[PDB]
């Protein structure tokens, strides 16, 4: 159920080579809160910005949720070559997302010979393990 303490979800960004603004995935519910993948072009040299967002649309300023997660960019040719980084963060209204502005080089992810991009699509994945939130379901 949505109360699950962990989950793995993916989001495929299309027309990736042409990305110019931040894109958000639909929500995946964990601990009954909406978690989303956020991707955007950055420049450390261009790089892929990859963040995990939590409960960002809520007007509440009383909530908080500590979570650990594995942010991964899927390599469709070989799963063992997927690029991953781990995070640990206390999510709350003032810091509702966390990740890396320079997750990996843009030139690498968009290289047709590396295996991360196909038909200009790149798939992002997040495995999140969150603790029970505070200031939500009193």
């Amino acid at each position: 159920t949505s109360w699950r303490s962990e989950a793995t979800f993916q989001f495929t960004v299309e027309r990736f080579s042409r990305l110019s603004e931040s894109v958000l995935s639909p929500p995946c519910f964990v601990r009954n809160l909406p978690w989303k993948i956020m991707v955007m072009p950055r420049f450390y040299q261009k790089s892929v910005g990859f963040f995990l967002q939590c409960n960002a649309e809520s007007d509440s300023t009383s909530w908080s949720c500590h979570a650990q997660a594995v942010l991964k960019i899927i390599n469709y040719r070989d799963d063992e070559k997927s690029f991953s980084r781990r995070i640990s963060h206390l999510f709350f209204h003032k810091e509702n997302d966390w990740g890396f502005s320079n997750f990996m080089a843009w030139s690498e992810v968009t290289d047709p010979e590396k295996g991360f991009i196909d038909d200009d699509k790149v798939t992002f994945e997040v495995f999140v393990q969150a603790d029970a939130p505070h200031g939500v379901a009193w």
Binding site: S22, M38, M40, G49, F51, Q53, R85, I87, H89, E95, N96, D97, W98, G99, F100, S101, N102
Partner: peptide
């Protein structure tokens, strides 16, 4: 290299 918010 280092994590942060998207801000």
């Amino acid at each position: 290299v280092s994590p942060s918010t998207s801000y």
